Paper text:
ZnT/YiiP mediated Zn2+ transport is mainly powered by proton gradient. Here we determined four high-resolution structures of the plasma-specific hZnT1 and the synaptic vesicle-specific hZnT3.
A global 3.48-Å resolution map was obtained for hZnT1 purified without EDTA treatment, which allows unambiguous modeling of most regions except the intracellular histidine-rich loop (residues 138–240) and the C-terminus (residues 448–507), owing to their intrinsic high mobilities. The extracellular half of TM2 tilt towards the neighboring TM3, which creates a hydrophobic interface mainly through aromatic and aliphatic residues. Openings of both hZnT1 protomers face the extracellular space, revealing a negatively charged chamber at the TMD/ECD nexus. Considering that the cytosolic labile Zn2+ concentration ranges from picomolar to nanomolar, while the binding affinity between free Zn2+ and TMD region is measured at the micromolar level with purified ZnT/YiiP proteins, our Zn2+-unbound outward-facing ZnT1 conformation may reflect the post status when zinc ions are expelled out of the translocation passage. In ZnT1, three CTD Zn2+-binding sites were identified at equilateral-triangle positions, in contrast to two closely positioned Zn2+-sites in the YiiP or ZnT8 CTD domains, and none in ZnT7. ZnT1 SCD1 is overlapped with SCD1 sites found in ZnT8 or YiiP proteins, the peripheral SCD2 is composed of residues from both protomers, and the third Zn2+-site (SCD3) is close to the TMD/CTD nexus. Specifically, the Zn2+-chelating network of SIF site is mainly contributed by the intracellular loop residues connecting TM2 and TM3 (IL2-3) in YiiP, or by His137 on IL2-3 and His345 on CTD in ZnT8, while the ZnT1 SCD3 site is composed of CTD residues Glu371 and His373, and the C-terminal extension Cys446 and Cys447.
Residue numbers in the entry:
A (entry chain B): 6 to 137, 240 to 293, 306 to 422, 429 to 447
B (entry chain A): 6 to 136, 238 to 293, 306 to 422, 429 to 447
């Protein structure tokens, strides 16, 4: 039911975006107009997750992809992780700008209400996405929703502090502080500890998001690159492969995984005599069993002049595998 | 080489960042310093390309990567393409924001000069980057990333020139204020309003062109990392030619995929009739694979029906076998 949760969250994002646009139009606040389009990024993340899930629904050999689209979910997870990292850097740059150029919010009450609505939406999204292969895509979506929830917590706390520990002027009163620039060059009621509360909270949220996102990005990149899974030791596999009767040379051992538990192995063997190859093949498959290998393709090279006899004419092109 | 070009572009980017920082310090135009900080996007793109180029040369097998890190270049190209797409979406969002509300530029002269310097730097970068496919994929990604900011600098220069030549300023307190832009504190612009919306429309056209030119690279990188059979290899024809040899009666699981550039790996299961004189047909299947772009193969003969493959696990789990 992965598609159901994604569709529900996407529908909620649309409803909350429409609510924010309506609130902005009725209150004629341009900041809410600006913030309404900021969830196009979340909508894009949900669309990418949905596309990856839909394309991973099919796993069949095709004239375009022999393996099928099994690697669609890991690609979607990688795309979501990169998008989240880019968003984190963008909001970090925005936080630096806020440090350099502080802003003063308008109507803290409506901002607090919007933040509370967003916080409820985000916490129920976490309730849907806490996971009550395909988990990596769900993990990336959950990380994105958690980043949105942290942003909502930040805006709620910022609005609460600005409403409880700040005092501005509603008219031309004498409270101008030269810390913030004034238009055309224009007291102690409103301290400066609040204007800088939003940027520091944003920086902390950026650090938390990067901390919790780095493992997902690392795993997605390691899957997309042809890396042996961390649960498989190459040295032990080689040791058990050479300790097999009838086989003495094992070259071209390439081990990698497509997605999830679909680990694929490939090796060449010098299997002594041709007639008794079949008995050795079952032992080789069993040996792959003790490890985590299952997809296999073993080449029984028969006959020290050359390591691999079935090699091509010229490999100087480096067009091979390793 | 290629690493030297990346180091040179990184040095130029850092020099331009220093130039914009000092210009902002001596001018107090904080938008210039904001753009200097934005150049961290180019810094990050060049750093990613540098890391990919450094790690791609480790072609030898490793205890953690049996294939080696020769997939690093294509992964770096994919990362740069996704970063460029995200930057393009951010630019389009900013253009929509400018439609929502415009801004008045403080001083067209210094921003025009900074834009000219950026245009020259980006033109030098384009000259560097215009001239294995995997090595070229990273080069093309960096070239597109440079061209995006080159177009951005061109937009800045054009807007500055038009704003200076064809707009009327309003600084001193007078009747020159117009509600076209919001008036702080509740407050006749003889300059045409056509200029207030020159950054956004040009940025929209630029992002359209950038997305159009970055779609092919992103698609190619995604296809390579999705184990898509290369477009120059036909699976059906290769199956038909493999089944034409005398010693093979049936082939299953012709897993063909592209590793990087011109490295295609094909693993196939064939059913040979007899172990005697088997090497006669192994040479033929290797040759017929060579007849195409596949040079690194691995074939498993199966000597023996109802079952499709006589070698399989005890459970034949559909979630643990390939395809
Ligand atoms: C973020 C997640 C990324 C991973 C997930 C996506 C990975 C890519 C998906 C592969 C992909 C794009 C590749 C290029 C863009 C890659 C962008 C990557 C960007 C990464 C950031 C291959 O592209 C297609 O491949 C087909 C097979 O080679 C072939 O066309 C073939 O279909 C033509 C149909 O019109 C047809 O006319 C032509 O005759 C065919 O031969 C063409 O090559 C091409 O159309 C698209 O998927 C393909 O298209 C359909 C999709 O739903 C899907 O069609 C089915 O349902 C349709 C319902 O309406 C309807 O048509 C049919 O019921 C059925 O056909 C295909 O089954 C699927 O395979
Ligand atoms: C945009 C595309 C980017 C693609 C990048 C592809 C390349 C990735 C390179 C990183 C990576 C692959 C894993 C992926 C990480 C995340 C990657 C990014 C993911 C998101 C995209 C391999 O790379 C490591 O990097 C080393 C430093 O450069 C280098 O070693 C250099 O050493 C000399 C000194 O420098 C130099 O003289 C020599 O010449 C180099 O050999 C080797 O290449 C390698 O060891 C890291 O893997 C492992 O990470 C471990 C710590 O987690 C850590 O392991 C260690 O454990 C013990 C100590 O705890 C120690 O006892 C082990 O011995 C050791 O193993 C190592 O780091 C590495 O084993
Ligand atoms: C949003 C896009 C455009 C960028 C995504 C972030 C990258 C800039 C990051 C993500 C993962 C990072 C890599 C993670 C791990 C390593 C291994 C690291 O190697 C070590 O130093 C190992 C330890 C040692 O040798 O002491 C070198 C940096 C590198 C390649 C990092 C380089 C920067 C990377 C690619
Ligand atoms: C240096 C610039 C480019 C910023 C990079 C991101 C930062 C926000 C830092 C702050 C805290 C860092 C994290 C703190 C510690 C770790 C250790 C490690 O993950 C763990 O926590 C494993 C256990 C351990 O801490 O050793 C991998 C990197 C990570 C997540 C770090 C990744 C980079 C983070 C998120
Ligand atoms: C999400 C994006 C912004 C990337 C953030 C992290 C990166 C800036 C990379 C670049 C270099 C990386 C570091 C390179 C070397 C190491 C040593 C490495 O040491 C170990 O393996 C100790 C055991 C352990 O991992 O617990 C731990 C990861 C760490 C800190 C890496 C953490 C991730 C780093 C900081
Ligand atoms: C988070 C962002 C930055 C990632 C990059 C942008 C993606 C949202 C885009 C880039 C390429 C797009 C894909 C390009 C091509 C297609 C094929 C398309 O299917 C067809 O056109 C096939 C024929 C048919 O219509 O049936 C379905 C959408 C899809 C997967 C697109 C989904 C959205 C993608 C992944
Ligand atoms: C959705 C909003 C936020 C941005 C919209 C930007 C558009 C102006 C861009 C985005 C992607 C672009 C498309 C990306 C890919 C192609 C394919 C390109 O060639 C083809 O039709 C097939 C190419 C092939 O098969 O290699 C023609 C332009 C087109 C439709 C582009 C037209 C312009 C598009 C729609
Ligand atoms: Zn061999
Ligand atoms: Zn090899
Ligand atoms: Zn078979
Ligand atoms: Zn060859
Ligand atoms: Zn098994
Ligand atoms: Zn298969």
């Amino acid at each position: 039911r992965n598609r159901g949760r994604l569709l529900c969250m996407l529908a909620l994002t649309f409803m909350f975006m429409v609510l924010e646009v309506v609130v902005s139009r009725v209150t004629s606040s341009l900041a809410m107009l600006s913030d309404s389009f900021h969830m196009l990024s979340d909508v894009l993340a949900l669309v990418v997750a949905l596309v990856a899930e839909r394309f991973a629904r099919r796993t069949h050999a095709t004239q375009k992809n022999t393996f099928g689209w099994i690697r669609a979910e890991v690609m979607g997870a990688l795309v979501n992780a990169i998008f989240l990292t880019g968003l984190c850097f963008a909001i970090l740059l925005e936080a630096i700008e806020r440090f350099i150029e502080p802003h003063e919010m308008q109507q803290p009450l409506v901002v607090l209400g919007v933040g509370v609505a967003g916080l409820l939406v985000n916490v129920l999204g976490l309730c849907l996405f806490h996971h009550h292969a395909g988990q990596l895509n769900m993990r990336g979506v959950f990380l994105h929703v958690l980043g949105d929830a942290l942003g909502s917590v930040i805006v709620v706390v910022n609005a609460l502090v600005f409403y409880f520990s700040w005092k501005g002027c509603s008219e031309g009163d004498f409270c101008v502080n030269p810390c913030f620039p004034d238009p055309c060059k224009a007291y102690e009621a409103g301290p400066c500890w609040v204007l800088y509360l939003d940027p520091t909270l944003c920086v902390v949220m950026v650090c938390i998001l990067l901390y919790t996102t780095y493992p997902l990005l690392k795993e997605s990149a390691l899957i997309l690159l042809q890396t042996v899974p961390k649960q498989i030791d190459i040295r032990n596999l080689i040791k058990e492969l050479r300790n097999v009767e009838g086989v003495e040379e094992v070259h071209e051992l390439h081990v990698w995984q497509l997605a999830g538990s679909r680990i694929i192995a490939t090796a060449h063997i010098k299997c002594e005599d041709p007639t008794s190859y079949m008995e050795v093949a079952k032992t080789i498959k069993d040996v792959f069993h003790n490890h985590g290998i299952h997809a296999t393709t073993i080449q029984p090279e028969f006959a020290s002049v050359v390591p691999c006899e079935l090699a091509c004419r010229t490999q100087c092109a480096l067009k091979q595998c390793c």
